[PDB]
Design a protein around this ligand. Structure first.
Ligand SMILES: [Mg+2]
Ligand SMILES: [Mg+2]
Ligand SMILES: [Mg+2]
Ligand SMILES: [Mg+2]
Ligand SMILES: [Mg+2]
Ligand SMILES: [Mg+2]
Ligand SMILES: [Mg+2]
Ligand SMILES: [Mg+2]
Ligand SMILES: [Mg+2]
Ligand SMILES: [Mg+2]
Ligand SMILES: [Mg+2]
Ligand SMILES: [Mg+2]
Ligand SMILES: [Mg+2]
Ligand SMILES: [Mg+2]
Ligand SMILES: [Mg+2]
Ligand SMILES: [Mg+2]
Ligand SMILES: [Mg+2]
Ligand SMILES: [Mg+2]
Lengths: 70, 88, 65, 100, 271, 129
RNA sequence: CAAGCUUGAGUCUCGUAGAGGGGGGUAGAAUUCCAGGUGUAGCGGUGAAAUGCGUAGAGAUCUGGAGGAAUACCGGUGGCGAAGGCGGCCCCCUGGACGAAGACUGACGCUCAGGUGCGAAAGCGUGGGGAGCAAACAGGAUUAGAUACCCUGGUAGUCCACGCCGUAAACGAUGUCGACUUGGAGGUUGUGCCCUUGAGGCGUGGCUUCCGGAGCUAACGCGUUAAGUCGACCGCCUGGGG
């Protein structure tokens, strides 16, 4: 996440560029997920629900994109 | 792994033809040559419980081929076990 | 299309570092295939090469050494 | 009779003896009835991270076809050779020439 | 290998024998044997200085070479023999010139291996060379404390020494105890680790099994009269006092090292 | 593996009618053709074909009357795990004679009605209703 | 019983994809500790706080070193394995799976009581190793009590070698092996044709995910990878507690 401030510009934009680097590189999120140890089952279970509900959103979209509502 | 040179020698030895790969003698001979090769592997890696399970498929399969040969042709059975050396 | 390595049907080597640098982020993390578009067969080859380039110090493990 | 892709780096202070060291490694393999297919000497390059020190290095590429026993012996020669750091050994895709 | 004896007698139930079939089964080498007389712990004044020593089985000393001062001239191992005076088996070694010698037996040394000594030697177990040539981080036995002295560290069965670092003219060693020391870089060091590592797994099993190793019984202080030992005394198993040696000094915690002339070579004390 | 090819032939027919198919095929044998040579003249099945020279494929042309099928239910009786033989005096009767029962007497393969008319008994292959 | 036959079963040739297994090395990030250099009075922790660490100079920051364990990103309702399970890179020993085109043996087959082998985690034995987490334990809190959840510490253990143990919600709560019975949207791994027009289009193979037709049934639901229509063996069940 190294940033080099360019010729002057505003410090806010340099700060906004540094914040974008952490958001894009996932520095913030990795620390939270590794603060405590959860069992291997919980890791496998959470990924199960995450993928199942992600696909269920796609399968529930086709039941509303053609059915009139009002 | 029974390199192709070792395989090609055994078929021409035991087989009736040079292309008669698949007869009981050449199948039992190929199974026998690999089992004797694997003795040096499992004599040092004793905790290879996964590779050993594949050797017990070769031991059992050779056993079935001998019984079928013995029930069909005893004369061809007595020579093969004598050339190879087993059944004790 | 996303036809980059699928056109060049080969194995990906670690001595062509210019190609490898396209598939790593600014910090050196391998880029997930959801973005690059490469299929699963060449992702593993592309991933394995980077883990070989890092050992030979051709690529950086992180951006802070 | 296997194929290999030896690639090792000599650290730069002793980079003046690389040609006088290359000939010895290929002397054994040729002396042990094995062929050599490439000798790409990459010259002095720069590491992406210091090897505990020593920001530069001198790279070598071999691509040797030889029996496995020699390569087993060649591996330990790199280990005890002080000037050599981070030897590497690889496998088939027999004939190659590219990427200088 | 270790074998458990069968309980055919009360005194054979708890016996574990460490038996090696590779040891030579005959007589030792004649020119490398000297007389060795027991003492019983008595000094020239005739008074027992160290207690619990006496008896045993007669043994003849074997001249084991520790210096290994023969550059070049590779030698082959003829046989491996049992040495009563040590915990490690010894090895009879024949040099290409013709001489025969006795050396310590490393773990990886069989009957037929070739070894040698000197700076020119290769890095294999059993070979000897000064520390400046041994790679840092290696396992080493038969270390010397002074160049030419002969070798005093890592001499028992199965022990070894680690070479942690190297600083100028001195080499830092992690000893089997846990100590860190600085010995000169020119002290010779046989490369490898001493053999016969089963020596631990050997229970004597009976009282007389230690009597023929030369160890006499040990009477506890509490079982004596007050005049004979500081613990002493009592009418029915009383202790009431801090444990001490039979000469008043306190055991079980009190340190006793006092040298002040070899404290330069002690990087850190024993763990 | 498969240990009864006869129940295979019945199942192909039962599945075909329920799935409402035109014709079914299967490896052929003298027993399968003989049974087919019984259902055909009992009205249950139209003409069959035994085309094939080294891998004969007995093909049966199934039959329908309305939106429903002809073969009401066809089940195997003398399965290889339990074989059943019956005497002439106690040959069965399917649906009080409404349906047919295939038996293998020593004179060939015939319906139970044609076996009583001939005075014989044999292994009971199937009930076809 | 004899003689055949090729579909079942199996061998040979070529090749492909894999955290499949055993052994031996080597990296880089991070935590802890040790020795020092700058420097001040707080650090840590919680819902709030206290125990704890700190002027004997901590926490912060820089340099050097020692040790053990695990492998960020790739990473995927992805892959392999009979099940348990398997995740850095390299090497050398080894098992299995699949596909194209042909030769070859010619029923060599399926299931399996008693047996035999493997079998998570915790646990046991003898040696090692011990960074971090942490049963037991001690102190600080909340509480009417709090032998708990929360906080600061902390030993067996977790790690290695060789032996025991042989149990789990060891679970798709669904035994193995064959046959047949409308469809869609995908994932992964081969292949043979055209339009090697460059993307593509046409099909055939092997595993695998989701939704649903007939049908099944108590209903949920399953639905070509059946819980559908059938065959061959094996294991088990017969009201609830005790
Ligand atoms: Mg095979
Ligand atoms: Mg005692
Ligand atoms: Mg008394
Ligand atoms: Mg006194
Ligand atoms: Mg008393
Ligand atoms: Mg008292
Ligand atoms: Mg059983
Ligand atoms: Mg355990
Ligand atoms: Mg234990
Ligand atoms: Mg222990
Ligand atoms: Mg706690
Ligand atoms: Mg149970
Ligand atoms: Mg129980
Ligand atoms: Mg499980
Ligand atoms: Mg599950
Ligand atoms: Mg169950
Ligand atoms: Mg079975
Ligand atoms: Mg469904």
């Amino acid at each position: 996440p190294v940033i080099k401030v360019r010729e002057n510009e505003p410090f806010d934009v340099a700060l906004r560029r540094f914040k974008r680097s952490c958001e894009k590189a996932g520095v913030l999120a990795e620390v939270r997920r590794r603060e405590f140890y959860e069992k291997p089952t919980t890791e496998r279970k959470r990924a199960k629900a995450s993928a199942v509900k992600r696909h269920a959103k796609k399968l529930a979209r086709e039941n509303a994109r053609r059915t009139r509502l009002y | 792994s029974l390199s192709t040179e070792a395989t090609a020698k055994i078929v021409s030895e035991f087989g009736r033809d040079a292309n008669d790969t698949g007869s009981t003698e050449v199948q039992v001979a190929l199974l026998t040559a690999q089992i004797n090769h694997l003795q040096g592997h499992f004599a040092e890696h004793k905790k290879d419980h996964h590779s050993r399970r594949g050797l017990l498929r070769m031991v059992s399969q050779r056993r079935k081929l001998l019984d079928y040969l013995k029930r069909k042709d005893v004369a061809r059975y007595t020579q093969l076990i004598e050339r190879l050396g087993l059944r004790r | 299309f996303c036809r980059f390595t699928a056109e060049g049907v080969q194995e990906i080597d670690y001595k062509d570092i210019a190609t490898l640098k396209n598939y790593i982020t600014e910090s050196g993390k391998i880029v997930p295939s959801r973005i690059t578009g490469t299929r699963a067969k060449y992702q593993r080859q592309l991933a394995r090469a980077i883990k070989r380039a890092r050992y030979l110090s051709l690529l950086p493990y992180t951006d802070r050494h | 009779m296997r194929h290999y892709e030896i690639v090792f780096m000599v650290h730069p202070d002793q980079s003046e003896q690389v040609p006088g060291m290359i000939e010895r490694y290929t002397a054994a393999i040729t002396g042990a009835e094995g062929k050599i297919h490439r000798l790409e000497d990459w010259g002095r390059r720069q590491l992406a991270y210091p090897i505990n020190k020593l920001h530069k290095a001198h790279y070598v590429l071999m691509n040797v076809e030889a029996p496995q026993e020699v390569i087993d012996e060649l591996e330990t020669t790199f280990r005890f050779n002080d000037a050599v750091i981070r030897s590497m050994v690889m496998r088939t895709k027999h004939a190659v020439t590219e990427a200088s | 290998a270790v074998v458990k004896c069968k309980p055919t007698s009360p005194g054979r139930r708890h016996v574990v024998k460490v038996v090696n079939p590779e040891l030579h089964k005959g007589k030792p080498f004649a020119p490398l044997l000297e007389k060795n007389s027991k003492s019983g712990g008595r000094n020239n004044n005739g008074r027992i200085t160290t207690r619990h020593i006496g008896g045993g089985h007669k043994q003849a000393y074997r001249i084991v070479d520790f210096k290994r001062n023969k550059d070049g001239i590779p030698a082959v191992v003829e046989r491996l023999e049992y040495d009563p005076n040590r915990s490690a088996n010894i090895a009879l070694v024949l040099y290409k010139d013709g001489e025969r010698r006795y050396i310590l037996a490393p773990k990886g040394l069989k009957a037929g291996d070739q070894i040698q000594s000197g700076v020119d030697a290769a890095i294999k177990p059993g070979n000897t060379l000064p520390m400046r040539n041994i790679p840092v981080g290696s396992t080493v036995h038969n270390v010397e404390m002074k160049p030419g002295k002969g070798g005093q560290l890592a001499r028992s069965a199965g022990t070894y020494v680690q070479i942690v670092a190297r600083d100028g003219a001195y080499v830092t060693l992690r000893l089997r105890s846990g100590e860190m020391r600085k010995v000169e870089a020119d002290c010779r060091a046989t490369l490898g680790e001493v053999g016969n590592a089963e020596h631990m797994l050997r229970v004597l099993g009976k009282a007389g099994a230690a009597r023929w190793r030369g160890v006499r019984p040990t009477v506890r202080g509490t079982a004596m009269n007050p005049v004979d030992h500081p613990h002493g005394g009592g009418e029915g198993r009383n202790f009431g006092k801090h444990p001490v040696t039979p000469w008043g000094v306190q055991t079980k915690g009190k340190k006793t090292r006092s040298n002040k002339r070899t404290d330069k070579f002690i990087v850190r004390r024993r763990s | 593996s498969m240990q009864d090819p006869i129940a295979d032939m019945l199942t192909r027919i039962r599945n075909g009618q329920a799935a409402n198919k035109a014709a079914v095929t299967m490896p052929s044998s003298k027993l399968k053709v003989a049974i087919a040579n019984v259902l055909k003249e009992e009205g249950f099945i139209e003409d069959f074909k035994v085309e094939g020279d080294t891998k004969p494929e007995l093909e049966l042309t199934l039959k329908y009357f309305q939106g429903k099928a002809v073969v009401e239910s066809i089940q195997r009786v003398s399965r290889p795990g339990l074989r059943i033989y019956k005497r002439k005096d106690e040959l069965p009767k399917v649906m009080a004679g409404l349906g047919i029962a295939v038996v293998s007497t020593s004179k060939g393969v015939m319906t139970d009605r044609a076996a009583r008319q001939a005075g014989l008994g044999g292994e009971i292959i199937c009930y076809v209703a």
